[PDB]
Design an enzyme around this catalytic site. Structure first.
Site, PDB file in Angstrom:
ATOM      1  CB  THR A  35      -0.928  -0.008   1.214  1.00  0.00           C
ATOM      2  OG1 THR A  35      -1.767  -1.300   1.290  1.00  0.00           O
ATOM      3  CG2 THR A  35      -2.137   1.256   1.069  1.00  0.00           C
ATOM      4  CB  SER A  36       3.423   2.721   2.099  1.00  0.00           C
ATOM      5  OG  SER A  36       2.063   3.449   2.988  1.00  0.00           O
ATOM      6  NE  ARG A  55       5.051 -11.464   2.939  1.00  0.00           N
ATOM      7  CZ  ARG A  55       4.271 -12.550   3.718  1.00  0.00           C
ATOM      8  NH1 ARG A  55       4.778 -13.766   3.968  1.00  0.00           N
ATOM      9  NH2 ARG A  55       3.077 -12.051   3.981  1.00  0.00           N
ATOM     10  N   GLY A 111     -11.883  -2.499  -0.423  1.00  0.00           N
ATOM     11  CA  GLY A 111     -11.894  -1.507  -1.529  1.00  0.00           C
ATOM     12  C   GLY A 111     -12.528  -0.191  -1.059  1.00  0.00           C
ATOM     13  CB  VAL A 112     -13.878   1.087   2.033  1.00  0.00           C
ATOM     14  CG1 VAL A 112     -14.660   2.407   2.503  1.00  0.00           C
ATOM     15  CG2 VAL A 112     -15.030  -0.030   2.331  1.00  0.00           C
ATOM     16  CB  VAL A 216      13.633  -8.593   2.392  1.00  0.00           C
ATOM     17  CG1 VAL A 216      14.710  -7.982   2.931  1.00  0.00           C
ATOM     18  CG2 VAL A 216      13.294  -8.319   0.797  1.00  0.00           C
ATOM     19  CG  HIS A 450      -9.224  -1.540   9.052  1.00  0.00           C
ATOM     20  ND1 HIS A 450      -9.983  -0.379   8.614  1.00  0.00           N
ATOM     21  CD2 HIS A 450      -9.442  -2.376   8.149  1.00  0.00           C
ATOM     22  CE1 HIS A 450     -10.551  -0.349   7.695  1.00  0.00           C
ATOM     23  NE2 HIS A 450     -10.315  -1.681   7.375  1.00  0.00           N
ATOM     24  CG  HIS A 488     -12.731   1.914   5.627  1.00  0.00           C
ATOM     25  ND1 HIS A 488     -13.716   2.299   6.188  1.00  0.00           N
ATOM     26  CD2 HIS A 488     -12.965   0.437   5.524  1.00  0.00           C
ATOM     27  CE1 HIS A 488     -14.905   1.464   6.257  1.00  0.00           C
ATOM     28  NE2 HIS A 488     -14.259   0.117   6.065  1.00  0.00           N
TER      29      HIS A 488
HETATM   30  C1  LIG Z   1      -9.082  -8.536   4.218  1.00  0.00           C
HETATM   31  C2  LIG Z   1      -8.843  -6.984   4.401  1.00  0.00           C
HETATM   32  C3  LIG Z   1      -9.838  -6.012   4.091  1.00  0.00           C
HETATM   33  C4  LIG Z   1      -9.568  -4.714   4.228  1.00  0.00           C
HETATM   34  N1  LIG Z   1     -10.503  -3.637   4.078  1.00  0.00           N
HETATM   35  C5  LIG Z   1     -10.063  -2.323   3.794  1.00  0.00           C
HETATM   36  C6  LIG Z   1     -11.000  -1.504   3.133  1.00  0.00           C
HETATM   37  O1  LIG Z   1     -11.788  -1.762   2.651  1.00  0.00           O
HETATM   38  N2  LIG Z   1     -10.465  -0.090   3.029  1.00  0.00           N
HETATM   39  C7  LIG Z   1      -9.432   0.271   3.708  1.00  0.00           C
HETATM   40  O2  LIG Z   1      -9.131   1.456   3.456  1.00  0.00           O
HETATM   41  N3  LIG Z   1      -8.284  -0.632   4.167  1.00  0.00           N
HETATM   42  C8  LIG Z   1      -8.837  -1.968   4.223  1.00  0.00           C
HETATM   43  N4  LIG Z   1      -8.045  -3.077   4.875  1.00  0.00           N
HETATM   44  C9  LIG Z   1      -6.769  -2.347   5.740  1.00  0.00           C
HETATM   45  C10 LIG Z   1      -5.528  -1.986   4.862  1.00  0.00           C
HETATM   46  O3  LIG Z   1      -5.862  -2.520   3.460  1.00  0.00           O
HETATM   47  C11 LIG Z   1      -4.217  -2.086   5.562  1.00  0.00           C
HETATM   48  O4  LIG Z   1      -4.276  -1.757   6.934  1.00  0.00           O
HETATM   49  C12 LIG Z   1      -3.093  -1.416   4.804  1.00  0.00           C
HETATM   50  O5  LIG Z   1      -3.370  -1.958   3.218  1.00  0.00           O
HETATM   51  C13 LIG Z   1      -1.706  -1.793   5.126  1.00  0.00           C
HETATM   52  O6  LIG Z   1      -0.672  -1.616   3.995  1.00  0.00           O
HETATM   53  P1  LIG Z   1       0.669  -1.634   4.342  1.00  0.00           P
HETATM   54  O7  LIG Z   1       1.516  -1.060   3.048  1.00  0.00           O
HETATM   55  O8  LIG Z   1       1.148  -1.321   5.983  1.00  0.00           O
HETATM   56  O9  LIG Z   1       1.093  -3.288   4.183  1.00  0.00           O
HETATM   57  P2  LIG Z   1       0.836  -4.120   3.016  1.00  0.00           P
HETATM   58  O10 LIG Z   1      -0.086  -3.625   1.805  1.00  0.00           O
HETATM   59  O11 LIG Z   1       0.552  -5.411   3.286  1.00  0.00           O
HETATM   60  O12 LIG Z   1       2.219  -4.154   2.133  1.00  0.00           O
HETATM   61  C14 LIG Z   1       3.350  -5.026   2.780  1.00  0.00           C
HETATM   62  C15 LIG Z   1       3.981  -6.055   1.723  1.00  0.00           C
HETATM   63  O13 LIG Z   1       5.208  -6.403   2.429  1.00  0.00           O
HETATM   64  C16 LIG Z   1       5.658  -7.925   1.819  1.00  0.00           C
HETATM   65  N5  LIG Z   1       6.337  -8.244   2.734  1.00  0.00           N
HETATM   66  C17 LIG Z   1       6.209  -8.582   4.170  1.00  0.00           C
HETATM   67  N6  LIG Z   1       7.592  -8.865   4.449  1.00  0.00           N
HETATM   68  C18 LIG Z   1       8.413  -9.023   3.644  1.00  0.00           C
HETATM   69  C19 LIG Z   1       9.659  -9.305   3.279  1.00  0.00           C
HETATM   70  N7  LIG Z   1      10.340  -9.760   4.293  1.00  0.00           N
HETATM   71  N8  LIG Z   1      10.063  -9.233   1.938  1.00  0.00           N
HETATM   72  C20 LIG Z   1       9.337  -8.877   1.031  1.00  0.00           C
HETATM   73  N9  LIG Z   1       8.250  -8.413   0.995  1.00  0.00           N
HETATM   74  C21 LIG Z   1       7.602  -8.561   2.353  1.00  0.00           C
HETATM   75  C22 LIG Z   1       3.866  -8.324   1.876  1.00  0.00           C
HETATM   76  O14 LIG Z   1       3.782  -9.548   1.302  1.00  0.00           O
HETATM   77  C23 LIG Z   1       3.139  -7.118   1.392  1.00  0.00           C
HETATM   78  O15 LIG Z   1       2.942  -7.352   0.415  1.00  0.00           O
HETATM   79  C24 LIG Z   1      -8.358  -4.312   4.848  1.00  0.00           C
HETATM   80  C25 LIG Z   1      -7.250  -5.182   5.194  1.00  0.00           C
HETATM   81  C26 LIG Z   1      -7.607  -6.671   5.220  1.00  0.00           C
HETATM   82  C27 LIG Z   1      -6.734  -7.567   5.317  1.00  0.00           C
HETATM   83  O1  LIG Z   2     -14.856  -2.485   6.033  1.00  0.00           O
HETATM   84  C1  LIG Z   2     -15.938  -3.062   4.984  1.00  0.00           C
HETATM   85  C2  LIG Z   2     -16.370  -4.388   5.591  1.00  0.00           C
HETATM   86  C3  LIG Z   2     -16.449  -4.568   6.857  1.00  0.00           C
HETATM   87  C4  LIG Z   2     -16.602  -6.101   7.080  1.00  0.00           C
HETATM   88  C5  LIG Z   2     -16.497  -6.976   6.085  1.00  0.00           C
HETATM   89  C6  LIG Z   2     -16.330  -6.579   4.818  1.00  0.00           C
HETATM   90  C7  LIG Z   2     -15.997  -5.353   4.652  1.00  0.00           C
END
Ligand SMILES: Cc1cc2nc3c(=O)[nH]c(=O)nc-3n(C[C@H](O)[C@H](O)[C@H](O)COP(=O)(O)OP(=O)(O)OC[C@H]3O[C@@H](n4cnc5c(N)ncnc54)[C@H](O)[C@@H]3O)c2cc1C
Ligand SMILES: OCc1ccccc1
Ligand SMILES: *[C@@H]1O[C@H](CO)[C@@H](O[C@@H]2O[C@H](CO)[C@@H](O)[C@H](O)[C@H]2NC(C)=O)[C@H](O)[C@H]1NC(C)=O
Ligand SMILES: *[C@@H]1O[C@H](CO)[C@@H](O[C@@H]2O[C@H](CO)[C@@H](O)[C@H](O)[C@H]2NC(C)=O)[C@H](O)[C@H]1NC(C)=O
Ligand SMILES: *[C@@H]1O[C@H](CO)[C@@H](O)[C@H](O)[C@H]1NC(C)=O
Ligand SMILES: *[C@@H]1O[C@H](CO)[C@@H](O)[C@H](O)[C@H]1NC(C)=O
Ligand SMILES: *[C@@H]1O[C@H](CO)[C@@H](O)[C@H](O)[C@H]1NC(C)=O
Length: 509
Positions: A35-36, A55, A111-112, A216, A450, A488
């Site tokens: 995501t970031s 990964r 996807g929100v 990594v 989250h 979200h």
């Molecule tokens: C099922 C689900 C539904 C959600 N619904 C919503 C929503 O509707 N709207 C919303 O705003 N948010 C939602 N969220 C929450 C939100 O998406 C997350 O909190 C956020 O995207 C986290 O992003 P991040 O960049 O911190 O981690 P990530 O996006 O997971 O990025 C980390 C990446 O690092 C990789 N990685 C980890 N360790 C290593 C390593 N050692 N070497 C190489 N790669 C590595 C992982 O595989 C991953 O791809 C949801 C989350 C989930 C699980």
């Molecule tokens: O955040 C939206 C949502 C909540 C719970 C289950 C699916 C989607």
């Protein structure tokens, strides 16, 4: 943005880690293409040579990630080590999921889309460039975010929130404000998912090189500086990559990934790393500490007449609770993490999943290593759900307004029996029961997904996201903040990726 297919132009600079150099050299190395991670690597590639390591595999290998219909499928699918969804059960005993795919959690989420609560910028203490934050939002929005169409059930829930008293009507807005609104979605009107990996298209193809299936293992160190990384491929061969002059290694591996990697690199609490036979490089008692997950509390109504399945788009926002609903088709295989346990009843027909989120939370746990050498073995995680009593109070209010929501004339036509009480609804699982609502929350808590924390700004990092003490090392992901930016958070963290990237390019100029 508008309605289009998922952009895979970035695949021209995507390689398996098996086909990368044994010893590499880049200006910036970003760990975790999520995501970031994806917008960060892309922003930095506009001027300098960037390596992005992931990964997981590419999203085309699992096609059901790319649609709105296939959201449950990824959670239903068995975790074999290669699948885009990784299953884990926290020490709390609650089932949960994390992403293992290029694009990260955005590839598997609900996807929100939403911009951060405006009060969040001021309360952090960090001096944000507000004008640049907004331009970065627009940059993300013009690529992957659309205005959703009217959905029958979502409009019912939206009409229900207003009738329940969640005021005012905000209409269509992306901002986290008190009241009821239709928000943005990273699912387009055609049902195609648009995620973080598509923002890789916005970076320069000559500078950015993406390496999938790159596990990594360790951050390399030499005044203390981060010099590079060790990553292992599909075949098991070790690779090394190093940063050039004034270049930086940034960790975007997530709430679970980043603290696990930092601890494996020897950056963490002294006595803890010594008890695992890890050479301590930088003492910091806060790595893996202060890990949060907002509680999800829910009810499932089973309407007598079939209802159309929908993506979550209409939100009911108050200071003490955030509420939304998702309508789904029935299934014989349970989607892991959607319900806290696998010992859970299966829906006989189309159902409505109606949830509430507790802000904060104030309850916190930790990420600790299970394996002292292998990164492919998942770390131990605990959240301590409702260990703080204020979170439990905030649930009680949320369950009361969900009670109010079921009592609305908007949700009345979906009752199985024409009775005065909410027992007229048919329920999947546990229905709503002041002491009675406390028990309901403790027993029927699910993860909202989250989760955040583990490498906090002001505990592990400074106000510019650099790890304290260590030079040329930063962390940009969900592990950085102890409280939610909004209901979200993906929208904030998509923005944050480019934001820090633009700040780094500012420093170099
Ligand atoms: C099922 C689900 C539904 C959600 N619904 C919503 C929503 O509707 N709207 C919303 O705003 N948010 C939602 N969220 C929450 C939100 O998406 C997350 O909190 C956020 O995207 C986290 O992003 P991040 O960049 O911190 O981690 P990530 O996006 O997971 O990025 C980390 C990446 O690092 C990789 N990685 C980890 N360790 C290593 C390593 N050692 N070497 C190489 N790669 C590595 C992982 O595989 C991953 O791809 C949801 C989350 C989930 C699980
Ligand atoms: O955040 C939206 C949502 C909540 C719970 C289950 C699916 C989607
Ligand atoms: C509308 O939706 C369909 C399905 O989500 C999209 O079809 C995909 O198109 C690409 C090529 O453009 C193919 O590689 C995929 O295999 C297709 N998916 C499926 C499930 O068939 C379509 O592109 C979308 N169109 C727009 C304009 O958004
Ligand atoms: C689907 O399953 C639910 C599971 O309980 C059924 O809901 C019950 O329905 C009866 C009336 O037939 C009520 O007296 C119960 O109170 C309901 N239970 C709950 C927990 O609300 C539902 O009937 C099933 N659907 C069909 C079509 O049979
Ligand atoms: C930033 O965006 C918000 C709405 O998203 C707006 O209210 C605010 O005025 C903007 N601030 C600046 C400094 O552009
Ligand atoms: C926004 O954040 C502040 C704290 O900074 C909080 O008091 C407020 O409740 C939040 N707003 C909403 C609508 O949740
Ligand atoms: C809840 O968290 C707050 C943080 O402000 C703290 O004052 C208190 O110790 C916690 N309360 C309980 C009951 O754990």
């Amino acid at each position: 943005a508008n309605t289009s297919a998922h952009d895979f132009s970035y695949l021209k600079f995507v390689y398996n880690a098996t086909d990368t150099s044994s010893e590499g050299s880049y200006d910036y190395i970003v760990i975790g293409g999520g995501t970031s991670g994806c917008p960060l690597a892309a922003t930095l590639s506009e001027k300098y040579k960037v390596l992005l390591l992931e990964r997981g595999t590419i999203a085309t290998e699992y096609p059901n990630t790319l649609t709105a219909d296939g959201f449950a499928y990824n959670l239903q699918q068995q975790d074999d080590g290669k699948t885009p969804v990784e299953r884990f059960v926290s020490e709390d005993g609650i089932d949960n999921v994390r992403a293992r795919i290029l694009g990260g959690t955005t590839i598997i989420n609900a996807g929100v889309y939403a911009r951060a609560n405006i009060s969040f910028y001021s309360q952090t203490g960090i001096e944000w460039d507000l004008d640049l934050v907004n331009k970065t939002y627009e940059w993300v929005e013009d690529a992957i975010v659309v205005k959703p169409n009217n959905q029958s059930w979502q409009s019912v829930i939206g009409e229900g929130f207003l009738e329940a008293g969640i005021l005012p009507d905000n209409g269509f807005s992306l901002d986290h404000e008190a009241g009821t609104r239709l928000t943005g979605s990273t699912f387009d009107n055609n049902g195609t998912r648009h995620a973080a990996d598509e923002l890789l298209n916005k970076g320069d193809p000559n500078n950015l090189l993406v390496a999938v299936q790159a596990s990594v293992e360790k951050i390399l160190f030499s005044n203390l500086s981060a010099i590079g990384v060790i990553y292992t491929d599909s075949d098991g061969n070790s690779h090394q990559a190093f940063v050039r002059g004034n270049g930086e290694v940034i960790v975007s591996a997530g709430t679970i990934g980043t603290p696990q990697l930092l601890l494996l690199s020897g950056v963490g609490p002294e006595s803890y790393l010594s008890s695992l036979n890890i050479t301590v490089v930088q003492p910091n008692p806060y790595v893996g500490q202060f890990v949060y997950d907002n509680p999800r509390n829910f009810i499932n109504i089973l309407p007598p007449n079939p209802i159309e399945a929908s993506v979550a788009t209409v939100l009911g926002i108050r200071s003490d609770y955030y509420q939304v609903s998702l309508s789904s088709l029935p299934f014989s295989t349970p989607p892991f993490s959607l319900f806290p346990t696998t010992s859970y009843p299966l829906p006989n027909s189309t159902f409505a999943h109606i949830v509430s989120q507790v802000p904060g939370p104030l309850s916190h746990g930790s990420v600790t290593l299970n394996s002292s050498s292998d990164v492919r073995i998942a770390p131990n995680i605990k959240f301590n759900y409702y260990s703080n009593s204020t979170d439990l109070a905030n649930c009680v209010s949320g369950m009361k307004k969900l009670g109010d929501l079921l009592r609305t004339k908007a949700l009345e036509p979906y009752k199985a029996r024409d009775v005065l009480g909410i027992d007229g609804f048919n329920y999947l699982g546990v229905p709503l029961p002041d002491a009675s609502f406390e028990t309901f929350c403790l027993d029927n808590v699910a993860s909202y997904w989250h989760y955040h924390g583990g490498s906090l700004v002001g505990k592990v990092l400074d106000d510019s996201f650099r790890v304290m003490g260590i030079k040329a090392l930063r962390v940009v992901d969900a592990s950085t903040f102890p409280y939610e930016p909004n209901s979200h958070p993906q929208g904030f963290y998509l923005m944050l990726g480019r934001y820090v990237g633009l700040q780094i390019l500012q420093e170099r100029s």
